[PDB]
Amino acid sequence: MMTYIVFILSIIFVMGFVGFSSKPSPIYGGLGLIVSGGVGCGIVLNFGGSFLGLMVFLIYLGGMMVVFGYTTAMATENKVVLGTFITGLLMEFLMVYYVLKDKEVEIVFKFNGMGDWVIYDTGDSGFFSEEAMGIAALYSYGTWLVIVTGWSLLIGVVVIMEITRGN
Amino acid sequence: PFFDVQKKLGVDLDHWMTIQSAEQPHRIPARCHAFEKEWIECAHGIGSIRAEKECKIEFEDFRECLLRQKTMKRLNAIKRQRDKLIKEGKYTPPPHHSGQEDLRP
Amino acid sequence: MWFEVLPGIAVMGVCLFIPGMATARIHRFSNGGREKRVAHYSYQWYLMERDRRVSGVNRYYVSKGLENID
Amino acid sequence: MNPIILIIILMTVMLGTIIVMISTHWLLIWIGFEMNMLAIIPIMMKKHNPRATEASTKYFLTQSTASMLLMMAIIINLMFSGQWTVMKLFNPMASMLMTMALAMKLGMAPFHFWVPEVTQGIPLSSGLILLTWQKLAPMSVLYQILPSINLDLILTLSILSITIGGWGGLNQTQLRKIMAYSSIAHMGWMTAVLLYNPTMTLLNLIIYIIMTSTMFTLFMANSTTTTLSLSHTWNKAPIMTILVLITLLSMGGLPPLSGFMPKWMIIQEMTKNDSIILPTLMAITALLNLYFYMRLTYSTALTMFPSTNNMKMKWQFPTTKRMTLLPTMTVLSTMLLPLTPILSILE
Amino acid sequence: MNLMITLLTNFTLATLLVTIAFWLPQLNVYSEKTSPDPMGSARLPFSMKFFLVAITFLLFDLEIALLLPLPWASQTTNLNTMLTMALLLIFLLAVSLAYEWTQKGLEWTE
Amino acid sequence: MSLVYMNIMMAFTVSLTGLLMYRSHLMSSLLCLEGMMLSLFILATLMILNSHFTLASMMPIILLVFAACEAALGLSLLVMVSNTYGTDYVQNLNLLQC
Amino acid sequence: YPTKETAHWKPPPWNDVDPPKSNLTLNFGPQHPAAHGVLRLVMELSGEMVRKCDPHIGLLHRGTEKLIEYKTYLQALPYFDRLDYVSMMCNEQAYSLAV
Amino acid sequence: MFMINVLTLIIPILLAVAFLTLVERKVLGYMQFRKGPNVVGPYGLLQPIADAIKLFIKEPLRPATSSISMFILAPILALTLALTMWIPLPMPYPLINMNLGVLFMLAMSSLAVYSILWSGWASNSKYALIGALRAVAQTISYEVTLAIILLSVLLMNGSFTLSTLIITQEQVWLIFPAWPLAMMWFISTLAETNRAPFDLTEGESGFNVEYAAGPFALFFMAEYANIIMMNIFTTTLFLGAFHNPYMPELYTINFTIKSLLLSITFLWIRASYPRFRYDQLMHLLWKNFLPLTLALCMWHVSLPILLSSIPPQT
Amino acid sequence: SMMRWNRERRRLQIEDFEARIALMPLLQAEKDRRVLQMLRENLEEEATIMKDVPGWKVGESVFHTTRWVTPMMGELYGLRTGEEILSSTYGFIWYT
Amino acid sequence: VAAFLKNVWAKEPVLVASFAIAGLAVILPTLSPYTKYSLMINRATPYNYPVPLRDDGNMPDVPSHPQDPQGPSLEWLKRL
Ligand SMILES: CCCCCCCCCCCCCCCCCC(=O)OC[C@H](COP(=O)([O-])OCC[N+](C)(C)C)OC(=O)CCCCCCCCCCCCCCCCC
Ligand SMILES: CCCCCCCCCCCCCCCCCC(=O)OC[C@H](COP(=O)(O)OCCN)OC(=O)CCCCCCCCCCCCCCCCC
Ligand SMILES: CCCCCCCCCCCCCCCCCC(=O)OC[C@H](COP(=O)(O)OCCN)OC(=O)CCCCCCCCCCCCCCCCC
Ligand SMILES: CCCCCCCCCCCCCCCCCC(=O)OC[C@H](COP(=O)(O)OCCN)OC(=O)CCCCCCCCCCCCCCCCC
Ligand SMILES: CCCCCCCCCCCCCCCCCC(=O)OC[C@H](COP(=O)(O)OCCN)OC(=O)CCCCCCCCCCCCCCCCC
Ligand SMILES: C=C(C)[C@H]1Cc2c(ccc3c2O[C@@H]2COc4cc(OC)c(OC)cc4[C@@H]2C3=O)O1
Ligand SMILES: C=C(C)[C@H]1Cc2c(ccc3c2O[C@H]2COc4cc(OC)c(OC)cc4[C@@H]2C3=O)O1
């Protein structure tokens, strides 16, 4: 049961999206997307992407969904929602029952039903996280990427100040 | 259009993140470095039409390194026959696959 | 006078002293009288699991030296 | 808007298109589309009225959904190929998702439902940018992935675009919506010949950009956004009615005009590949857009109209509007058919 | 694993104390209150400046996200390129701040 | 293939169907769009970490940063709609039907 | 071609500009210490700015100077301590100089 | 055995937060030429106990809320985040020794604004929502300089590891090469925790005026559970103590004394100044701290390269 | 002071890395015998399990090449108990 | 050049300190002599294994042992 923990989080992740795509309100939609970001971040952290998991927490949840909740507060002061929620939940639990009774499934692609602990690597990486040094490579190998991203963010600041002015 | 400015000016804008076989930081290999290298060296220069049919075996080896569908299928078959013989009782696990042997190195 | 604030400061200081001394004594207790092994990097984890194998008692902290080889 | 900031934002639109055109890595393709969208959003909100905010919001949602589908296509390509080259895709699911996403960025049917609205809500210069410059980057990506494009999907999208662009502009009196349904129909004409000969796709793209640039430049020169204000042009400047005459006759595909040039070549490249029925019904549908062009120039451009007395004030002032490249674009959008073998420079 | 134990323990202790806080004085039968604010019932007006400082936070937080691998990037062998791109990113953050300055975006929450 | 990939793609398609046909708050559409971005982040991260392809470790951060900037842009459009109608109901965005 | 459904569609405006289809009013009542006691304030704000400030007083109106008319001069003297009740002997001195 | 370590972390946190109220009232008393509590306990030592029991037996509001569920989730998230900030703190050894503890604490402290936002949602008072939005914009403003100052210092650390930061300061305190970072950091942590002169929750009515004594005592204590933590974090970051690995309690006494003096420095700042106007601290962040913080971030990028003092990666 | 101490710390890091380098051939030899041990044990247990299945080749490579492929995690720890599986698959990630 | 500088140092000393520290951070690594040693130390740090070479017969500059006098040395780092 502990061997499938990534898989278990993934189920919650799917559930979390059906939690907010049913859309009772942007308030509870934001709450569901924050819980979904937490559990998908747990998925990322369980493969060794610790820096990318802390980028989910710092930038997605701590940076951006704060601004979504802020704008939901300031600008935005059932049957369809609950029905779409229970519909997606029944679809996902029938998928879980299929893939656990069969250990093989095909919706669009062919998917194994064992846990994803098998597909890892048996080596080590010495005195570094490979993911950390690959993100450190943004400044040494990623010059053009830094240029286009910084120009896009500068243009993003300029564009926000243009269209929020109204004049 | 693909205006190949990077080759005309001789600059390396984004060829480096393109494949797994490229120069990585601290010489870290990808898991399928050898397979991708073999498939790239097969399909080089012969065009995509000849590459889809003349480099099928390297590409199948590389896609099966990436996804491990055949390996997981074989592990499913072995684990399923093992579970059947455990349920029937015609097989017993050895002490080195039950965790009673105090590993080697 | 001003030394009346010192009993509350001393109580709060004991409350801040307890977690650090606690985790120091617990890490010395659970690791064979020594510091907890820090495995930030995969080489450290490989050496630590190799220690757990070569100890023979399924503990990384049980150290084996020259007496273990002939 | 500050003209320096306007120059910087237009250079960022151009820079995003250039990054999509030149880059070898799929992430930089996605980055170029993100840069292009993020930069073009203020060009649509130049006049700051609620129609432009609605148009920019609809454009944002369509291009953002298209960009997410593009990144999902890139990610499935990474699953099934382990690499990032902008070349053919290595999964038909990535092929379908990227064809859908580029169809959303072009405005092809069944994702056409924003192109008549957004073009209506934004000014004529930003609508010119939307219907000409924003077609260059997804046609470049479609030009580079055509070994992986499913033929049935691209032909379904193409003929659906041609039928909806044909039967959507029959009802239209707004000039920007006529240009938008014309856009949808011409993108169908470009993408149906894509897997047969992509040079004729580029030929159709360049002739379309010339004719669309001519039409929006005449619209800005006359300040006419409707059919009825276009009818009031002969009493102000008679040559402008002649130019919208010849350019609308060219966009439907009359011989011997230049807009007959691409689609004829397209039919010429579809019968080589033994497709007879498809370019036949394709040009049957193009006869319907030519037919409402001929109503929209016969009934309401040629035979002269009741005017208003205030127009006799406007006789005393000439046009000081910068009609940039307008005679060159009007000559090229009409009189280029004798140079039809120029297309080989696009090979 | 021990991390999840710690997080679960903190969530458990917080939920325990919050439930005891919400339900230990609900044992009391104090009184039932009817009780029939600066604004009375007016709708909350949108403040444009609060939204502008939230988006300015979001964009500078993204520029921070680009800045975050610098202690690892200082360990590279391509230090001239790395130092150039680091100074370029902090300069572009400063240019975004200067444009936010001079276009009066930082006013009445300066 | 991997089984967690099916769940991440199913999450992506759930938020994609939540974006497409509801005709509700505009903020709910932006929430579905950023859920699509979240699932793309998770899926790119699990693939790049799975294959040990080191240079693409900076790729999801890029996928974060641009798209979060994109999100900021969307909110400003919403605020302009929120400065026009008082609501973010997308059925107020029907001026351009005619 | 206007059909039965596409019949209420009026043309868009000629300049493509539609009409745009208010400021906050706060009531800081007698529930507040940094106003020095008993004051109601009807603020009219425009964001951070104060457009209008309407003080409502009378929350300590006690009819002092109607009570003074029914008391003698010596009996009326301690009312003046209780007017400016951090300036007691100054108000005593003002009333005493008057008398 | 690990659960004993978690409990001896988190129960003394709540006790230290309880007696921090007494230390606040006493130290503010003597600075104001008076006494703090000395009646309830001997030298006031039973005042936090009596106060916590008094709050836990008051009637709660249970008002008409826009959300009951977020009215419940705001104290739970507040206490849970206030307790999880302490788990990578190396004193001298942490509960959870992680490679990215600094970035962990930055991310979890960025998550703390949802307590303020949900507490502003849960009260139906629109003015409490306005004050919550002002508090959130204050906190997200100063998180920017927290992130950039912390990045500039970790350029001298070499990693995101909090225990490496003890090895970093074995010769000199890191306040000597980074005192402008240290003083902007200290004022920014003061502005993070809604602490005077940056508090805007007592006067022009805060976000947590809806809460009365059931959740409020929890909110408050979670808030002070941040404050000590931030000072402890500042103590790790700029005032790194001597660590003898054979006597760890030397480090524990040394960092405890420094963290107490720094929390008392918070108390001594709030008793000495008036408050900011709201746009004045927005002026303080966006126009005074942020250009200097960018300039010093450029200086701490280029400085180890130009002195050949790039710190070790491991 | 930070200049002198970070130069000293870089010298100490080089010393630690050279101790690692000097130990790496012995660790490489033990790791090679470790993985060939586990593959040979899985091969013998497959040979004693997979006899009921018709058309089965024991130890059949799924790769068309004859190059040595680095063994996957579920290839080595596929027939062992869940404790050793969980250790070898999430121990370093879950370590403290 | 000193009237405007004294004026901005009297009005905006925060921005004067900001632009001065930023200017020093830009220009000073191009003037420091120690910037070479940063590069030299970051390439002297052995993250990977020093993979040996097959002795073809003629490689005099490659040592046969770590303690041999030929090869790269770190005496510049031990002295500094
Ligand atoms: C961590 C341990 C403790 C750290 C120290 C903190 C303890 C003491 C705290 C005292 C009480 C503080 C209460 C809060 C006060 C908030 C208000 C305030 O101070 O605002 C900040 C004020 C803001 O300015 P202001 O508010 O005074 O003025 C108004 C602003 N103008 C002028 C624009 C109208 O100052 C700063 O922002 C300074 C921040 C630190 C500056 C560091 C400078 C470094 C020097 C570099 C060299 C310079 C020389 C020239 C170049 C040389 C080159 C070689
Ligand atoms: C990490 C460090 C943490 C430290 C936390 C604690 C700090 C403070 C420690 C205690 C300080 C002294 C407290 C003394 C309280 C007053 C005692 C007393 O005399 O109370 C008198 C009262 C009534 O007495 P009565 O008999 O009626 O008198 C008539 C006489 N003819 O009789 C009574 O009220 C009954 C007796 C009450 C005694 C209460 C004592 C304090 C309890 C506090 C709880 C925590 C204790 C410490 C926990 C950690 C150590 C184990
Ligand atoms: C294989 C592909 C490789 C690449 C090939 C090249 C592709 C070319 C695509 C051209 C797209 C042009 C889009 C429009 C020009 C861009 C800048 C712009 O919008 O300029 C218009 C400008 C706006 O000024 P403003 O003040 O805002 O006007 C409002 C009115 N008061 O000023 C005005 O409004 C003035 C009015 C006249 C403007 C006429 C502009 C004509 C531009 C198109 C020229 C023809 C296309 C080039 C040749 C064919 C190339 C395919
Ligand atoms: C309304 C909903 C409820 C709201 C209240 C409760 C939620 C909020 C408060 C709790 C927040 C939980 C945050 C958990 C993850 C924090 C990031 C993290 O784990 O970083 C630490 C560390 C990275 O460092 P590293 O040293 O590389 O790892 C060891 C490798 N040698 O990584 C590790 O050590 C990895 C350890 C294994 C993986 C840990 C996964 C934890 C569980 C996933 C998140 C659960 C919470 C989901 C909700 C979040 C908030 C919405
Ligand atoms: C080349 C070096 C690197 C440069 C890039 C990195 C910069 C790091 C700091 C980032 C700062 C970001 C924001 C900067 C905005 C600058 C413009 C500005 O503030 O102008 C307005 C100001 C008048 O102030 P006001 O508009 O009223 O604002 C309210 C305060 N009263 O007017 C002013 O304050 C006048 C500002 C210009 C004069 C400053 C001169 C400083 C000289 C220091 C010594 C030389 C340093 C070498 C570099 C030259 C710098 C000019
Ligand atoms: C956590 C425990 C054990 C108790 C003690 C306690 C609370 C809850 C809230 C508070 C508190 O202690 C003090 C009480 O007195 C003041 C007085 C103040 O100003 C006079 C002041 O200003 C910020 C703050 C306060 C604290 C405050 O709010 O629960
Ligand atoms: C109203 C619209 C859209 C079009 C259709 C139309 C006109 C103008 C004029 C005429 C016309 O209908 C045609 C019908 O058939 C022919 C056939 C002819 O030749 C085949 C021919 O030669 C001049 C002339 C005619 C008609 C003719 O005069 O504008």
Curated annotation (Swiss-Prot), chain D:
Q: Name one GO biological process term.
A: mitochondrial respiratory chain complex I assembly
Q: Where in the cell is it found?
A: Mitochondrion inner membrane
Q: Name one GO cellular component term.
A: respiratory chain complex I
Q: Which GO terms describe its molecular function?
A: NADH dehydrogenase (ubiquinone) activity
Give the stretches traversing the membrane: 3-23, 25-45, 67-87, 96-116, 122-142, 145-165, 178-198, 200-220, 237-257, 274-294, 325-345
Q: Does the keyword Transport apply?
A: yes
Kindly indicate whether the keyword S-adenosyl-L-methionine belongs to this entry.
Answer: no
Superkingdom assignment: Eukaryota
Main localisation, per the record? Answer: mitochondrion
Give the membrane topology, semicolon-separated if more than one.
Multi-pass membrane protein
Q: Any idea which UniProt keywords this protein has?
A: Electron transport, Membrane, Mitochondrion, Mitochondrion inner membrane, NAD, Respiratory chain, Translocase, Transmembrane, Transmembrane helix, Transport, Ubiquinone
- Extract the InterPro entries matched here: Complex_I_Subunit_2, NADH_DH_su2_C, NADH_UbQ_OxRdtase_chain2, ND/Mrp_TM
| Catalytic reactions of this protein | a ubiquinone + NADH + 5 H(+)(in) = a ubiquinol + NAD(+) + 4 H(+)(out)
Q: What is its EC number?
A: 7.1.1.2
Provide the assembly information: Core subunit of respiratory chain NADH dehydrogenase (Complex I) which is composed of 45 different subunits. Interacts with TMEM242.
The role this protein plays is: Core subunit of the mitochondrial membrane respiratory chain NADH dehydrogenase (Complex I) which catalyzes electron transfer from NADH through the respiratory chain, using ubiquinone as an electron acceptor. Essential for the catalytic activity and assembly of complex I.
What family does the Swiss-Prot or TrEMBL record give for this protein?
Belongs to the complex I subunit 2 family.
Q: What is this protein called?
A: NADH-ubiquinone oxidoreductase chain 2
Write the lineage as a comma-separated list. Answer: Eukaryota, Metazoa, Chordata, Craniata, Vertebrata
Swiss-Prot record, chain E:
Query: Known Pfam families for this protein?
Result: Oxidored_q4
| Class of the enzyme per the UniProt entry, highest EC level | translocase
> Which keywords, in A-to-Z order, does the entry hold?
Electron transport, Membrane, Mitochondrion, Mitochondrion inner membrane, NAD, Respiratory chain, Translocase, Transmembrane, Transmembrane helix, Transport, Ubiquinone
Quote the subcellular location field of this record.
Mitochondrion inner membrane
Q: How does it sit in the membrane?
A: Multi-pass membrane protein
Q: Which InterPro entries match?
A: NADH_UbQ/plastoQ_OxRdtase_su3, NDAH_ubi_oxred_su3_sf
Which EC number(s) does UniProt give?
Answer: 7.1.1.2
- Chief localisation class: mitochondrion
Query: Which GO terms of the cellular component aspect does the record hold?
Result: mitochondrial inner membrane; respiratory chain complex I
Q: Does the keyword Signal apply?
A: no
Q: What GO terms describe the biological role, i.e. biological process, of this protein? A: mitochondrial electron transport, NADH to ubiquinone
Q: Which domain of life is it from?
A: Eukaryota
One example of the protein's molecular function in GO is: NADH dehydrogenase (ubiquinone) activity
Which reaction is catalysed here? a ubiquinone + NADH + 5 H(+)(in) = a ubiquinol + NAD(+) + 4 H(+)(out)
Q: What does this protein do?
A: Core subunit of the mitochondrial membrane respiratory chain NADH dehydrogenase (Complex I) which catalyzes electron transfer from NADH through the respiratory chain, using ubiquinone as an electron acceptor. Essential for the catalytic activity of complex I.
How it assembles, according to the record, is:
Core subunit of respiratory chain NADH dehydrogenase (Complex I) which is composed of 45 different subunits. Interacts with TMEM186. Interacts with TMEM242.
* Entry protein name: NADH-ubiquinone oxidoreductase chain 3
Swiss-Prot record, chain F:
InterPro entries associated with the record: NADH_UbQ_OxRdtase_chain4L/K (IPR001133), NUOK/Mnh_C1-like (IPR039428)
What topology does it adopt in the membrane?
Answer: Multi-pass membrane protein
Q: Name one GO biological process term.
A: ATP synthesis coupled electron transport
One Pfam family name is Oxidored_q2
Which key words are in the record?
Electron transport, Membrane, Mitochondrion, Mitochondrion inner membrane, NAD, Respiratory chain, Translocase, Transmembrane, Transmembrane helix, Transport, Ubiquinone
Q: Name one GO molecular function term.
A: NADH dehydrogenase (ubiquinone) activity
**Major localization listed first in the record, in broad terms:** mitochondrion
What Enzyme Commission number(s) appear in the record? Answer: 7.1.1.2
Tell me where on the tree of life, at the top rank, the source sits: Eukaryota
Task: Name any GO cellular component annotation.
Answer: respiratory chain complex I
Spell out the PANTHER family in the cross-references: NADH-UBIQUINONE OXIDOREDUCTASE CHAIN 4L (PTHR11434:SF0), NADH-UBIQUINONE OXIDOREDUCTASE SUBUNIT ND4L (PTHR11434)
Protein role: Core subunit of the mitochondrial membrane respiratory chain NADH dehydrogenase (Complex I) which catalyzes electron transfer from NADH through the respiratory chain, using ubiquinone as an electron acceptor. Part of the enzyme membrane arm which is embedded in the lipid bilayer and involved in proton translocation.
Query: Record's family?
Result: Belongs to the complex I subunit 4L family.
Q: Could you tell me what this protein is called?
A: NADH-ubiquinone oxidoreductase chain 4L
From Swiss-Prot, chain H:
Top enzyme category? translocase
Q: Which reaction does it catalyse?
A: a ubiquinone + NADH + 5 H(+)(in) = a ubiquinol + NAD(+) + 4 H(+)(out)
Q: Which UniProt keywords apply?
A: Electron transport, Membrane, Mitochondrion, Mitochondrion inner membrane, NAD, Respiratory chain, Translocase, Transmembrane, Transmembrane helix, Transport, Ubiquinone
User: One Pfam annotation, family name?
Assistant: NADHdh
Q: For this protein, what is the EC number?
A: 7.1.1.2
The UniProt entry's coiled-coil ranges are: none
GO CC terms of this entry: mitochondrial inner membrane; respiratory chain complex I
Disulfide bond residue pairs: none
Sorted alphabetically, which PROSITE patterns does this protein's record hold? COMPLEX1_ND1_1 (PS00667), COMPLEX1_ND1_2 (PS00668)
- Annotated membrane-spanning segments are 2-22, 68-88, 100-120, 147-167, 172-192, 213-233, 249-269, 290-310
Cellular location(s): Mitochondrion inner membrane
Major localization class: mitochondrion
Q: Which GO terms describe its biological process?
A: mitochondrial electron transport, NADH to ubiquinone; mitochondrial respiratory chain complex I assembly
Q: Which GO terms describe its molecular function?
A: NADH dehydrogenase (ubiquinone) activity
In the bilayer, the protein is annotated as:
Multi-pass membrane protein
Please report which protein family the annotation says this sequence is part of.
Answer: Belongs to the complex I subunit 1 family.
Q: What does this protein do?
A: Core subunit of the mitochondrial membrane respiratory chain NADH dehydrogenase (Complex I) that is believed to belong to the minimal assembly required for catalysis. Complex I functions in the transfer of electrons from NADH to the respiratory chain. The immediate electron acceptor for the enzyme is believed to be ubiquinone.
Under the heading PANTHER family, the entry gives:
NADH DEHYDROGENASE SUBUNIT 1 (PTHR11432), NADH-UBIQUINONE OXIDOREDUCTASE CHAIN 1 (PTHR11432:SF3)
Output this protein's name: NADH-ubiquinone oxidoreductase chain 1
